[PDB]
C-alpha cells in the first residue's frame, strides 16, 4: 500500500481524496496547462500546483503519467 493499487480501488480513491483531486485530476487526465486546469475547476493555477502535488502525493500516485494512468487505469479517462 505504498504506491498505486488495483484498478477500481484507484477510482473509488480518486473520489475519497477530495474535490482538489477529482478537480485537478479530471484536468490532468487530459494534460492541459496549469492555468486552464485551475480555471477549469474554478480555481487558481497556484492552487492546482498545491492540489496536484498533493493529489498525486496522497492519491498514491508518482508523476503526471502515473496519476492519469491510475486515473484511466480505473475510470478517470476522458473518451
Domain ranges of the chain: 7-75
DSSP class per residue in the chain? --S---SHHHHHHHHHH-HHHHHHHHHHTTT--HHHHHHHTTS-HHHHHHHHHHHHHHTT--SHHHHHHHHHHHT----
Residue 61 CA to chain centroid, in angstroms? 8
Q: Contact 60/4 with Cβ under 8 angstroms? A: yes
Method: NMR
Sign of CA dihedral 41, 63, 61, 13: positive
The CATH topology of domain 7-75 is Arc Repressor Mutant, subunit A (1.10.10)
Amino acid at each position: 500500500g505504498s504506491h498505486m493499487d488495483d484498478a477500481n480501488d484507484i477510482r473509488a480513491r480518486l473520489q475519497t481524496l477530495s474535490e482538489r483531486e477529482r478537480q485537478v485530476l479530471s484536468a490532468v487526465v487530459a494534460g492541459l496547462p496549469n492555468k486552464s486546469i485551475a480555471y477549469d475547476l474554478d480555481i487558481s493555477p497556484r492552487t492546482v500546483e498545491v492540489h496536484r502535488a498533493n493529489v498525486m502525493a496522497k492519491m498514491k500516485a508518482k508523476s503526471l503519467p502515473h496519476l492519469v494512468r491510475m486515473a484511466l487505469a480505473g475510470g478517470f479517462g476522458p473518451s
